[PDB]
Design a protein around this ligand. Structure first.
Ligand SMILES: CC#CCOc1ccc(S(=O)(=O)N2CC[C@H](S)C2)cc1
Ligand SMILES: [Zn+2]
Length: 266
């Protein structure tokens, strides 16, 4: 099983909510798309150059298919919620949503567009409790996988539609501060890594959680350790095992060819 050039790319829906647009894009479309285009490039760089078998099974990446920028809050009726509404949920005195509820709701609301891509990712700007930066559904090689890349849908009778949990989100706000772009690069790489089927690197396995004087942790380590060490922008063998099986299984199904189109999504 070696890479198919016509199926080596996971096409991505990128969504920026009004909070990201206002604070990170400074309320400019141009600034917003520039920031996201460059972040996905840097994330893709990590992925393409990763050899999941440590041999030559590499060149798998991600490419933006759509950048959906929501320029104001979603109008809502009493009772209703929407991942892009003005207030945070379920507690509107907090800066941020409950982050699990946010991913669930983003997944529900963005379902029509998520059905058309390998992954959908929300970019937002809020301070989640406990210093959380991202969250994503974990992929799997299982034929009946219901999360991450190329998942099976859950049907929503109330929504009269299929819901796909091929989703995740990143916040570039933490403890009231905008994070460094190189920190943001890592979080999104981490959240996408779950989608591709990796769990956290266990602090147990030293070869998957090397000490600082050993080159530092790999990207799927569940704490944002300060300073930049070599391993930070690499996938551990623990991650590589999981992600390799997942790709090998799912790429034929919903990966595409690398392209540089004039217009995406037509
Ligand atoms: C800098 C860097 C890096 C590696 O990426 C991370 C992403 C999310 C987190 S987190 O704090 O949000 N944690 C709770 C949920 C998520 S998926 C893991 C911690 C680290
Ligand atoms: Zn994680």
């Amino acid at each position: 099983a070696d890479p198919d050039p016509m199926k080596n790319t996971c096409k991505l829906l990128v969504v920026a909510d009004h909070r990201f647009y206002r604070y990170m894009g400074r309320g400019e479309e141009s600034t917003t798309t520039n920031y996201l285009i460059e972040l996905i490039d840097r994330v893709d760089d990590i992925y393409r150059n990763t050899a999941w078998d440590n041999a030559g099974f590499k060149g798998y990446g991600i490419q933006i298919e759509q950048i959906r920028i929501l320029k104001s809050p979603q109008e809502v009726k009493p009772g209703e919620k929407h991942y892009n509404m003005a207030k945070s949920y379920p507690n509107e005195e907090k800066d941020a949503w409950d982050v699990k509820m946010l991913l669930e709701q983003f997944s529900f609301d963005i379902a029509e567009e998520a059905s058309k891509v390998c992954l959908a990712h929300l970019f937002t700007y809020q301070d989640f409790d406990m210093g959380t930066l991202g969250l994503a559904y974990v992929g799997s090689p299982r034929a009946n996988s219901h999360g991450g890349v190329c998942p099976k849908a859950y049907y929503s009778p109330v929504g009269k539609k299929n819901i796909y949990l091929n989703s995740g989100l990143t916040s570039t706000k933490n403890y009231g501060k905008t994070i460094l772009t190189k920190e943001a690069d890592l979080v999104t790489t981490h959240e996408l890594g779950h989608n591709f089927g990796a769990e956290h690197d266990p602090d147990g396995l030293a070869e998957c959680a090397p000490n600082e004087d050993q080159g530092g942790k790999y990207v799927m380590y569940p704490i944002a350790v300060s300073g930049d060490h070599e391993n930070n922008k690499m996938f551990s063998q623990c991650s590589k095992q999981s992600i390799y099986k997942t790709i090998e299984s799912k790429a034929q199904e919903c990966f595409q060819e690398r392209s540089n189109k004039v217009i995406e999504g037509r």
